[PDB]
């Protein structure tokens, strides 16, 4: 504001603000049984398989 009192008029001012990024990491575990993976690649030819 430019005013007519005796105090000092202000020059132009700027601010430079620097924000950052917080990083987050999530982990969940999954167990596959070895008796369950073994028949996934096998050959099936009977109605029980």
């Amino acid at each position: 504001i430019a005013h007519g009192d005796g105090r000092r008029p202000n020059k132009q001012r700027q601010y430079i603000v620097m924000k950052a990024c917080n990083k987050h990491h999530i982990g969940a575990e999954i167990e596959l049984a070895a008796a369950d993976i073994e028949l996934l690649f096998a050959e099936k030819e009977t109605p029980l398989d």
């Binding site: 007519g4 009192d5 005796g6 000092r8 008029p9």
Partner: protein, 294 residues
């Protein structure tokens, strides 16, 4: 190039009374505090250091004067005072309306002094705003020095009283004047005198002996126009120092240190800023001068 102008905002309309005094002194030098276009009236006075209820100390006021920027008036409008500015190193018109009147000419020399003859004549009061304005005085250097000579002599001989014709009168070719001392704070005028007691007793230790023997050959019979201070009688002290033999290379080392401490007395006898007038008009009372802060 550069601009220099100060227009002073003011919160009340002035009366016709105080407008007549400010119109009469339209070209006048007065200091002010800050270096801006817009300005309060409480900076324009020299009365921020020289008030009525506080006892003024003219050395401290003069000590104050070499800090401030200085200014010359242009107009007195009924609301706002309009002033121009003095900066190094600029030629400018200056016009003396200063009431203890002295005469200038082309190629004279000037300096700015506090009001030391009539404070009531040189300060006008503004009852409209409640703040009073003090004008300083501009004096040529010869009377610019000779007032500060008499003011330092006064504060030595007011302390000894713990009468007036020898202490408070400034002498000059053709005129005599009265310094204005009723209430002075001597303490800022005495730290100047405390440093004079430092230099002057060092200057009494390195006195050359050949220059004292020169006076013992001089003032006894050879009477000159400018040696009438001693009135024809030698002092009792000068006969006591010249008992030694004169030798040239002793005084060579003395007169160099005598030379170098007289360089230091510039610092204790300083005036304010100095004004070198190159052209002065007589019937118009204006001049032209370049401002030099030292």
């Amino acid at each position: 190039a550069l601009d220099k102008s100060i227009v002073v905002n003011l919160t009340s309309r002035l009366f016709a009374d105080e407008l007549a005094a400010l119109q009469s002194k339209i070209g006048s030098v007065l200091p002010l505090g800050d270096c801006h276009r817009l300005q309060n009236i409480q900076a324009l006075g020299l009365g921020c250091v020289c008030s009525r209820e506080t006892s003024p100390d003219y050395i401290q006021i003069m000590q104050y004067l070499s800090k401030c920027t200085l200014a010359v008036l242009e107009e007195v409008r009924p609301d706002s005072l309009r002033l121009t500015r003095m900066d190094p190193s600029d030629n400018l018109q200056i016009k003396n309306v200063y009431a203890p009147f002295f005469q200038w000419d082309s190629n004279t020399q000037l300096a700015v002094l506090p009001p030391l003859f009539s404070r009531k004549d040189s300060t006008i009061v503004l009852e409209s705003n409640g703040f009073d304005i003090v004008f300083p005085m501009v004096v040529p250097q010869q009377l610019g020095h000779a007032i500060l000579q008499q003011l330092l002599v006064y504060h030595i001989y007011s302390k000894i009283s713990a009468l007036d014709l020898y202490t408070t009168n400034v002498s000059f070719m053709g005129r005599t004047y009265r310094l204005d001392v009723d209430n002075t704070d001597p303490r800022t005028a005495l730290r100047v005198l405390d440093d004079l007691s430092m230099y002057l007793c060092i200057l009494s230790a390195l006195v050359p002996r050949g220059c004292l023997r020169l006076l013992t050959a001089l003032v006894r019979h050879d009477r000159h126009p400018l040696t009438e201070v001693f009135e024809g009688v030698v002092p009792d002290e000068v006969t006591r120092i010249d008992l030694d033999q004169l030798s040239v290379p002793d005084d060579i080392t003395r007169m160099r240190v005598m030379f170098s401490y007289l360089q230091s007395l510039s610092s204790i006898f300083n005036l304010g800023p100095r004004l070198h007038v190159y052209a002065y008009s007589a019937e118009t009372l204006a001049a032209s001068c370049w401002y030099s802060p030292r």
